[PDB]
Amino acid sequence: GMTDCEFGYIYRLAQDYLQCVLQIPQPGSGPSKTSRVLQNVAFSVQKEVEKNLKSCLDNVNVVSVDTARTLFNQVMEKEFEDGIINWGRIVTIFAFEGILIKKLLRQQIAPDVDTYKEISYFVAEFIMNNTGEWIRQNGGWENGFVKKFEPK
């Protein structure tokens, strides 16, 4: 629907994906159709980035949620600085938060089981503020993203 560009829905998508990466999906009714489609395509992107940029990703130490947030904001800002928005770029936002939570799990100085909820929050903040209008104009998650990325 059109309200799926609001923060709450995006936050749930970002949290769903981190729980997917961390292998702790919550035993509710299950992730939404949107999330189920997003998890497969974002993970495929994530594993390709971690491979080709392995040596690159070993030069930064995500020791805290603050380092993850500034690193996320910095990298994402430069990715979208040309003003272009598309579903592929939005997918890479989720892929990158998955890269960050994996590094946090290993390197976080004081690990906290709620940390991935803080990551999901500033991920959703970025998506809403920088792509929310574009998402709505292109059908939202249900009528835009899912229609283009769901199985043939």
């Binding site: 940029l53 990298v75 598309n86 579903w87 770029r89 890479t92 990158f96 769901e150």
Partner: peptide
């Protein structure tokens, strides 16, 4: 330098997978 390499590769792979043209 690091943050530019990450931003570049993400932008590349983004516009790459973006050609999921369906519906």
């Amino acid at each position: 330098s690091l943050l530019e390499k990450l931003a570049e590769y993400l932008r590349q792979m983004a516009d790459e997978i973006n050609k999921k043209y369906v519906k």
